[PDB]
Write a protein that binds this ligand. Structure first.
Ligand SMILES: Nc1ncnc2c1ncn2[C@@H]1O[C@H](COP(=O)(O)OP(=O)(O)O)[C@@H](O)[C@H]1O
Ligand SMILES: [Mg+2]
Length: 152
């Protein structure tokens, strides 16, 4: 309900968690993603997009900050603020829009984030092994983790 944890040994397992998470996404959800470069934040997003029914490739949006995908069952607003110091962008319309936001490196703009979010931390744990921790902030995300673990 408040925290969930997984360990994965390949990118497909990481996408599989994200795929399932997307079944419980609702308009206005904001998911944050943290971890090293190469940890798997964008890989997670690729599986999340599969879960929403998006067929086109979902690649790292590092050099545009934001990428929109509208063909899924819910609009996906994929963000990476790694390069924000070089970018105003009005991320607020997306955060409180009718889609779902996945925000890589979100803590770099902590003060612009909505107070409530689902925080996803991807930690390296050996070669192709990752440890993924969901931390729910807000009743909505406690609700979401409730459903996810029940159907997990
Ligand atoms: N268990 C795993 N989960 C996610 N990615 C993995 C895993 N094992 C190896 N990888 C590889 O690590 C890289 C992660 O890339 P990416 O998702 O772009 O990282 P980030 O967005 O966090 O910088 C990919 O090349 C992926 O193939
Ligand atoms: Mg990335």
């Amino acid at each position: 309900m408040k925290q969930l944890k997984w360990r994965t040994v390949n990118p497909e397992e990481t996408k599989a968690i994200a795929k399932l998470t997307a079944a419980f996404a609702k308009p206005g959800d904001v998911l944050t993603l943290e971890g090293d470069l190469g940890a798997g934040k964008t890989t997670f997003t690729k599986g999340f997009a599969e879960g929403l029914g998006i067929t086109r490739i979902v690649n790292s949006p590092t050099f545009t900050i934001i990428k929109e995908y509208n063909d899924g069952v819910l609009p996906l607003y994929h963000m990476d603020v790694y390069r924000m110091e070089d970018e105003d962008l009005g991320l607020d319309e997306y955060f409180h829009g009718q889609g779902v936001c996945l925000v890589e490196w979100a803590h770099l703009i902590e003060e612009q984030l909505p107070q409530e979010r689902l925080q996803i931390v991807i930690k390296r744990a050996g070669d192709d092994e990752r440890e993924i921790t969901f931390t729910a902030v807000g009743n909505r995300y406690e609700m979401l983790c409730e459903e996810l673990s029940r159907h997990d």
